[PDB]
Amino acid sequence: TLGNTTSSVILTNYMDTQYYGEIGIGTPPQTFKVVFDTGSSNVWVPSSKCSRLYTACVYHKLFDASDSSSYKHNGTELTLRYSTGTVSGFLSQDIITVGGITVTQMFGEVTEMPALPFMLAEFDGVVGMGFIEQAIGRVTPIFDNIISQGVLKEDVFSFYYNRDSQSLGGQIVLGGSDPQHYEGNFHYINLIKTGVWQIQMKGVSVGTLLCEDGCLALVDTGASYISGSTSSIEKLMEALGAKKRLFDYVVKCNEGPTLPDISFHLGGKEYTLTSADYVFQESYSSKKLCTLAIHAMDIPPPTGPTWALGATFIRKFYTEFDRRNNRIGFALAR
Ligand SMILES: *[C@@H]1O[C@H](CO)[C@@H](O)[C@H](O)[C@H]1NC(C)=O
């Protein structure tokens, strides 16, 4: 079942690492800054029931069930595990607005929210855009719920991530794509399987050094960076002349623009990033260090080992997520 509505969510670009939009939960709406994340499937926001001893709950918007006349209790415990951290809490049901679409949605009220990393979040919560199969507690994801309404023109959603300074930080179209933010044709790659926004990758090139037998690529709107496995990144970085630090790889800022192209071989086409697309050029000095927007992340089975194509990739390539045809479309962003 399909309608005729298309709907956009305006996103704020925080330091090229966090892309978030506004959603409203409850009656009247309590507003939250949320990351729309294709790598997970649960909605959560911090709870008023979160102990103030969690400092992250002091520094973020808290959902207060006691102020919502449309709240429906459930209370089942849930733990959501991400790459960079974990949240715990319980399930609740309420009205959620996103792009002027209202859905009754089960979501997590988070009562346990670690200061690292959640103090470093501009956003309050997460809206998972993954499939029900990856949803913790088998809770229906928000998009599946929007699909049930039969209002969207297509069973698709699209991401645009900008660079950044008083302009559009990003955009999610629910029900289509926006031609004003892409050019040329979409080139589609089918998913490995329905359930995960993951596709076959045929190779990674520096300047084909890596993934020469084929590997996996998670198209992850909630990942800031392009990530590969530890040994894959170690080899990638050796070729770039980049040195390892605790959380990132750095190159000396001067040698930044001279860094080779990195190409990802997806569904026939070759998706190339220049150094400008993956280096945080904050200086041109030899005596300063510059961070690369490519990280090591060992994603566990059964999803892993896999590469993750995050904001670094999506900035260059406007991404359409097709649920009806179980594929991902890429076009040149503008
Ligand atoms: C929570 O939701 C599940 C599944 O919809 C349901 O079976 C259960 O009874 C609910 N629990 C409470 C306490 O509302």
Short mmCIF file of C-alpha atoms and ligand atoms in Angstrom, two decimals:
data_model
loop_
_atom_site.label_atom_id
_atom_site.label_comp_id
_atom_site.label_asym_id
_atom_site.label_seq_id
_atom_site.Cartn_x
_atom_site.Cartn_y
_atom_site.Cartn_z
CA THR A 1 0.00 0.00 0.00
CA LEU A 2 1.31 3.45 -1.12
CA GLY A 3 -0.02 7.04 -0.87
CA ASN A 4 1.16 10.30 -2.48
CA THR A 5 2.84 12.25 0.37
CA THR A 6 6.56 12.98 0.34
CA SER A 7 8.11 14.43 3.51
CA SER A 8 11.44 16.01 4.43
CA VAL A 9 13.33 16.28 7.74
CA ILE A 10 15.80 19.21 8.01
CA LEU A 11 19.18 18.19 9.51
CA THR A 12 21.80 20.14 11.47
CA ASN A 13 25.44 19.39 10.63
CA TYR A 14 27.54 19.35 13.76
CA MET A 15 31.29 19.44 12.98
CA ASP A 16 30.84 16.98 10.05
CA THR A 17 30.42 14.08 12.52
CA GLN A 18 26.86 14.44 13.85
CA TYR A 19 23.83 14.94 11.61
CA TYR A 20 20.56 15.31 13.48
CA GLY A 21 16.93 16.39 13.08
CA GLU A 22 13.97 17.33 15.25
CA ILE A 23 11.24 14.88 16.25
CA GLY A 24 8.34 15.49 18.67
CA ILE A 25 7.26 12.87 21.23
CA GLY A 26 3.98 13.04 23.19
CA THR A 27 1.03 15.38 23.74
CA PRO A 28 1.95 18.15 23.76
CA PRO A 29 5.11 17.43 21.70
CA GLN A 30 8.36 17.15 23.62
CA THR A 31 11.09 17.81 21.02
CA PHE A 32 14.32 15.83 20.63
CA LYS A 33 17.44 16.09 18.49
CA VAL A 34 17.90 12.66 16.92
CA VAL A 35 20.28 10.87 14.59
CA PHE A 36 18.59 8.93 11.83
CA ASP A 37 20.63 5.75 11.75
CA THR A 38 20.40 3.05 9.06
CA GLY A 39 22.77 0.89 11.14
CA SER A 40 20.21 0.26 13.92
CA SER A 41 16.40 -0.11 14.23
CA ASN A 42 15.27 1.28 17.60
CA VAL A 43 14.02 4.71 18.53
CA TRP A 44 15.30 5.99 21.87
CA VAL A 45 15.49 9.28 23.73
CA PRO A 46 16.77 9.99 27.26
CA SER A 47 14.22 9.52 30.03
CA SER A 48 13.20 11.89 32.83
CA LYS A 49 13.64 8.68 34.88
CA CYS A 50 17.38 8.75 34.12
CA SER A 51 19.34 9.34 37.32
CA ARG A 52 20.93 12.80 37.35
CA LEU A 53 24.14 10.98 38.33
CA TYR A 54 24.28 10.28 34.61
CA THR A 55 25.68 13.69 33.60
CA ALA A 56 24.56 13.08 29.99
CA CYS A 57 20.98 13.18 31.28
CA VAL A 58 21.72 16.58 32.85
CA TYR A 59 22.96 17.86 29.40
CA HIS A 60 20.18 16.49 27.16
CA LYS A 61 16.45 16.73 26.61
CA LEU A 62 14.55 14.17 28.71
CA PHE A 63 11.22 12.59 27.79
CA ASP A 64 8.77 13.02 30.63
CA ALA A 65 5.95 10.46 30.42
CA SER A 66 4.13 12.32 33.22
CA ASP A 67 3.70 15.32 30.84
CA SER A 68 2.24 13.32 27.93
CA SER A 69 -1.50 12.62 27.74
CA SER A 70 -0.97 10.12 24.86
CA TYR A 71 1.74 8.06 26.57
CA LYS A 72 1.15 4.32 26.86
CA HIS A 73 3.21 2.34 29.40
CA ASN A 74 5.04 -0.87 28.58
CA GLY A 75 8.18 -0.93 30.74
CA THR A 76 10.10 -3.86 29.18
CA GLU A 77 13.85 -3.48 29.80
CA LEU A 78 16.06 -2.88 26.80
CA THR A 79 19.77 -2.47 26.14
CA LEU A 80 20.94 -0.94 22.87
CA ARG A 81 24.55 -1.60 21.92
CA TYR A 82 26.30 0.67 19.40
CA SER A 83 29.95 0.79 18.17
CA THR A 84 30.92 3.68 20.43
CA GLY A 85 28.64 3.03 23.39
CA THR A 86 25.64 1.49 25.05
CA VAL A 87 22.30 2.76 26.36
CA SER A 88 19.88 1.01 28.68
CA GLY A 89 16.31 1.73 29.74
CA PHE A 90 12.78 0.58 29.07
CA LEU A 91 10.11 0.60 26.36
CA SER A 92 7.32 3.15 26.10
CA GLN A 93 4.69 3.98 23.49
CA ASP A 94 3.69 7.49 22.39
CA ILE A 95 2.82 9.69 19.40
CA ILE A 96 5.94 10.72 17.43
CA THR A 97 6.06 13.46 14.78
CA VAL A 98 8.76 13.36 12.11
CA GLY A 99 8.44 15.55 8.99
CA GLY A 100 4.79 16.30 9.82
CA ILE A 101 3.97 12.59 9.85
CA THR A 102 2.45 11.34 13.11
CA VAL A 103 3.03 7.71 14.13
CA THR A 104 2.19 5.77 17.27
CA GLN A 105 5.61 4.36 18.10
CA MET A 106 7.22 2.16 20.69
CA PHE A 107 10.58 3.63 21.73
CA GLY A 108 13.18 3.37 24.48
CA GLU A 109 13.18 5.67 27.44
CA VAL A 110 16.87 5.58 28.30
CA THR A 111 17.65 5.63 32.03
CA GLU A 112 21.35 4.69 31.70
CA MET A 113 23.42 6.89 29.44
CA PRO A 114 27.26 6.84 29.91
CA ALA A 115 29.07 10.20 30.00
CA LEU A 116 31.56 8.82 27.51
CA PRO A 117 30.42 9.01 24.82
CA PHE A 118 27.02 10.66 25.39
CA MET A 119 28.42 13.93 26.81
CA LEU A 120 30.00 14.34 23.36
CA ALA A 121 26.63 14.01 21.62
CA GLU A 122 24.89 17.13 20.32
CA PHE A 123 21.85 14.93 19.66
CA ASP A 124 19.60 13.50 22.41
CA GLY A 125 18.58 10.20 20.85
CA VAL A 126 18.47 7.90 17.85
CA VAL A 127 15.83 7.04 15.25
CA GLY A 128 16.83 3.65 13.82
CA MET A 129 16.15 3.34 10.07
CA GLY A 130 17.15 -0.34 9.86
CA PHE A 131 14.84 -3.31 9.39
CA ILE A 132 12.70 -5.05 12.07
CA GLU A 133 15.13 -8.04 11.95
CA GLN A 134 17.83 -5.93 13.65
CA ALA A 135 15.39 -4.37 16.17
CA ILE A 136 16.03 -5.15 19.83
CA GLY A 137 12.89 -6.46 21.57
CA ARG A 138 11.32 -7.10 18.12
CA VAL A 139 9.81 -3.56 18.29
CA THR A 140 8.42 -2.29 14.97
CA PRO A 141 10.83 0.36 13.56
CA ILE A 142 9.47 3.86 12.87
CA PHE A 143 9.67 3.58 9.05
CA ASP A 144 7.69 0.29 9.03
CA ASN A 145 5.06 2.14 11.05
CA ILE A 146 5.08 5.07 8.58
CA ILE A 147 4.75 2.49 5.72
CA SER A 148 1.61 0.94 7.33
CA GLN A 149 -0.20 4.30 7.05
CA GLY A 150 -0.16 4.15 3.22
CA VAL A 151 0.73 7.83 2.82
CA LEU A 152 4.28 7.78 1.39
CA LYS A 153 4.64 7.88 -2.43
CA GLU A 154 7.34 5.18 -2.35
CA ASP A 155 8.76 2.60 0.08
CA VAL A 156 12.04 4.64 0.15
CA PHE A 157 13.96 7.18 2.20
CA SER A 158 16.92 9.31 1.13
CA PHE A 159 19.84 11.02 2.87
CA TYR A 160 21.67 14.19 1.99
CA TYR A 161 24.61 15.21 4.22
CA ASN A 162 26.09 18.68 3.53
CA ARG A 163 29.44 20.19 4.54
CA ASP A 164 29.47 23.34 6.81
CA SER A 165 27.61 27.94 8.01
CA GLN A 166 24.04 29.29 8.31
CA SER A 167 22.76 26.91 5.59
CA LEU A 168 21.18 23.42 5.25
CA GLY A 169 23.17 20.87 7.29
CA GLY A 170 21.39 17.87 5.78
CA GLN A 171 18.03 16.46 4.65
CA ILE A 172 16.06 13.22 4.89
CA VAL A 173 13.23 12.72 2.41
CA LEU A 174 10.72 10.11 3.56
CA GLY A 175 8.89 8.64 0.56
CA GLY A 176 11.27 9.71 -2.20
CA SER A 177 14.46 11.58 -3.00
CA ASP A 178 15.16 15.29 -3.60
CA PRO A 179 16.61 16.06 -7.11
CA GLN A 180 17.85 19.45 -5.83
CA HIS A 181 20.59 17.60 -3.83
CA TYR A 182 21.81 15.00 -6.39
CA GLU A 183 22.89 14.87 -10.04
CA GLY A 184 23.38 12.24 -12.73
CA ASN A 185 21.71 8.86 -12.33
CA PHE A 186 21.26 6.69 -9.29
CA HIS A 187 23.31 3.51 -9.52
CA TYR A 188 21.80 0.72 -7.49
CA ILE A 189 23.32 -2.17 -5.58
CA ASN A 190 21.10 -4.96 -4.17
CA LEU A 191 21.38 -5.85 -0.48
CA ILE A 192 23.14 -9.09 0.53
CA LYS A 193 19.90 -9.89 2.38
CA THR A 194 16.79 -8.02 3.57
CA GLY A 195 17.16 -7.12 7.26
CA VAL A 196 20.43 -5.14 7.10
CA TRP A 197 21.39 -2.11 4.95
CA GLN A 198 24.50 -3.96 3.77
CA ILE A 199 25.81 -4.54 0.26
CA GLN A 200 28.57 -6.47 -1.49
CA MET A 201 31.77 -4.47 -2.04
CA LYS A 202 34.10 -5.64 -4.83
CA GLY A 203 37.27 -3.73 -3.82
CA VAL A 204 38.97 -0.82 -2.06
CA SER A 205 41.64 1.13 -3.95
CA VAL A 206 44.35 3.47 -2.73
CA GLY A 207 45.45 5.51 -5.76
CA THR A 208 43.52 -2.43 -5.57
CA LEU A 209 45.24 -2.87 -2.18
CA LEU A 210 42.23 -4.08 -0.12
CA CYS A 211 39.03 -6.20 -0.26
CA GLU A 212 40.28 -7.89 -3.48
CA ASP A 213 38.15 -11.04 -3.03
CA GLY A 214 35.03 -9.08 -2.05
CA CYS A 215 33.80 -7.83 1.32
CA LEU A 216 30.81 -6.26 3.07
CA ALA A 217 29.81 -2.60 3.20
CA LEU A 218 27.28 -1.36 5.73
CA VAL A 219 25.71 1.87 4.47
CA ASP A 220 25.48 3.55 7.86
CA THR A 221 23.88 7.01 8.16
CA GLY A 222 24.68 6.95 11.92
CA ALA A 223 28.42 6.29 11.45
CA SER A 224 30.50 9.49 11.23
CA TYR A 225 33.30 7.89 9.30
CA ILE A 226 34.18 5.23 6.79
CA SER A 227 35.28 2.27 8.87
CA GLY A 228 36.88 -1.05 7.99
CA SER A 229 38.23 -3.93 10.07
CA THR A 230 41.37 -3.26 12.18
CA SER A 231 43.78 -5.05 9.81
CA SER A 232 42.06 -3.48 6.76
CA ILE A 233 42.50 0.03 8.19
CA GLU A 234 46.08 -0.69 9.40
CA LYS A 235 46.94 -1.57 5.76
CA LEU A 236 44.97 1.39 4.35
CA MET A 237 46.79 3.76 6.73
CA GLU A 238 50.25 2.32 6.06
CA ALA A 239 49.67 3.23 2.37
CA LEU A 240 48.60 6.78 3.33
CA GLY A 241 51.60 7.28 5.67
CA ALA A 242 49.17 7.88 8.55
CA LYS A 243 50.08 7.18 12.18
CA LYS A 244 47.74 5.53 14.70
CA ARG A 245 46.43 7.33 17.74
CA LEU A 246 44.02 5.94 20.35
CA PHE A 247 40.72 6.89 18.67
CA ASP A 248 41.83 7.98 15.19
CA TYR A 249 44.49 8.06 12.51
CA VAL A 250 46.33 11.28 11.76
CA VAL A 251 48.56 12.56 9.04
CA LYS A 252 50.75 15.71 9.27
CA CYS A 253 48.49 18.55 8.02
CA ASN A 254 50.86 19.63 5.23
CA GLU A 255 50.86 16.21 3.55
CA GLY A 256 47.05 16.12 3.69
CA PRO A 257 46.26 17.43 0.16
CA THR A 258 48.94 15.12 -1.38
CA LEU A 259 47.22 11.97 -0.02
CA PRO A 260 45.97 9.55 -2.76
CA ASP A 261 42.37 8.89 -3.84
CA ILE A 262 40.38 6.13 -2.09
CA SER A 263 37.93 4.21 -4.26
CA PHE A 264 35.15 1.83 -3.22
CA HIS A 265 34.00 -0.65 -5.86
CA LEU A 266 30.20 -0.87 -5.47
CA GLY A 267 27.86 -2.59 -7.97
CA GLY A 268 29.84 -1.91 -11.15
CA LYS A 269 30.68 1.77 -10.54
CA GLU A 270 33.81 3.06 -8.76
CA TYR A 271 33.12 5.54 -5.91
CA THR A 272 36.16 7.77 -5.48
CA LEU A 273 37.05 10.07 -2.60
CA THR A 274 39.87 12.63 -2.83
CA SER A 275 41.87 13.66 0.28
CA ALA A 276 39.56 16.70 0.53
CA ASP A 277 36.66 14.24 1.05
CA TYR A 278 38.35 12.34 3.94
CA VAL A 279 40.87 14.72 5.61
CA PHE A 280 39.87 17.27 8.23
CA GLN A 281 42.01 20.10 6.77
CA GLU A 282 42.15 22.50 9.73
CA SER A 283 45.72 23.65 9.07
CA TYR A 284 48.42 23.35 6.38
CA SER A 285 51.28 23.23 8.92
CA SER A 286 53.85 20.41 9.08
CA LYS A 287 54.00 20.75 12.89
CA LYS A 288 50.23 20.09 13.33
CA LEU A 289 48.31 16.82 13.03
CA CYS A 290 45.13 16.35 10.99
CA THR A 291 42.45 13.68 11.57
CA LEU A 292 41.23 11.35 8.83
CA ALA A 293 37.53 10.62 8.49
CA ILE A 294 38.30 6.88 8.14
CA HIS A 295 38.45 4.75 11.31
CA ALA A 296 39.04 1.19 12.48
CA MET A 297 35.88 -0.54 13.76
CA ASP A 298 35.57 -4.28 14.26
CA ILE A 299 31.83 -4.81 13.83
CA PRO A 300 30.90 -8.24 15.31
CA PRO A 301 29.18 -11.26 13.61
CA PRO A 302 26.75 -11.80 12.09
CA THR A 303 26.84 -8.26 10.58
CA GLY A 304 30.68 -8.23 10.70
CA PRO A 305 33.40 -8.21 9.75
CA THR A 306 32.24 -5.33 7.54
CA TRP A 307 33.18 -1.90 6.26
CA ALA A 308 30.86 0.93 7.27
CA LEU A 309 30.13 3.70 4.79
CA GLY A 310 29.17 6.66 6.95
CA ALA A 311 28.90 10.44 6.76
CA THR A 312 32.30 10.65 4.97
CA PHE A 313 30.83 8.57 2.11
CA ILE A 314 27.25 9.99 2.19
CA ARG A 315 28.55 13.60 1.98
CA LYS A 316 29.90 12.84 -1.49
CA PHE A 317 27.08 10.46 -2.47
CA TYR A 318 23.38 11.14 -2.04
CA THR A 319 21.96 7.84 -0.80
CA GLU A 320 18.52 6.35 -1.46
CA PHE A 321 17.40 3.47 0.73
CA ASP A 322 14.88 1.35 -1.18
CA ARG A 323 12.79 -1.00 0.97
CA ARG A 324 10.39 -2.13 -1.82
CA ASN A 325 13.25 -3.44 -3.99
CA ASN A 326 15.82 -4.21 -1.20
CA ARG A 327 18.58 -2.05 -2.72
CA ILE A 328 20.62 1.09 -2.09
CA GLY A 329 20.94 3.86 -4.68
CA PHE A 330 23.90 6.23 -4.93
CA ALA A 331 24.07 9.50 -6.85
CA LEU A 332 26.56 12.42 -6.85
CA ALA A 333 25.51 14.90 -4.13
CA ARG A 334 25.19 18.64 -4.88
C1 LIG B 1 4.81 -4.77 26.20
O1 LIG B 1 4.61 -5.08 24.80
C2 LIG B 1 4.48 -6.49 24.49
C3 LIG B 1 4.42 -6.71 22.97
O2 LIG B 1 3.52 -5.78 22.35
C4 LIG B 1 3.26 -7.09 25.21
O3 LIG B 1 3.12 -8.50 25.00
C5 LIG B 1 3.38 -6.83 26.71
O4 LIG B 1 2.19 -7.27 27.38
C6 LIG B 1 3.65 -5.35 27.04
N1 LIG B 1 3.84 -5.26 28.49
C7 LIG B 1 3.25 -4.36 29.27
C8 LIG B 1 3.57 -4.50 30.73
O5 LIG B 1 2.51 -3.47 28.86
#
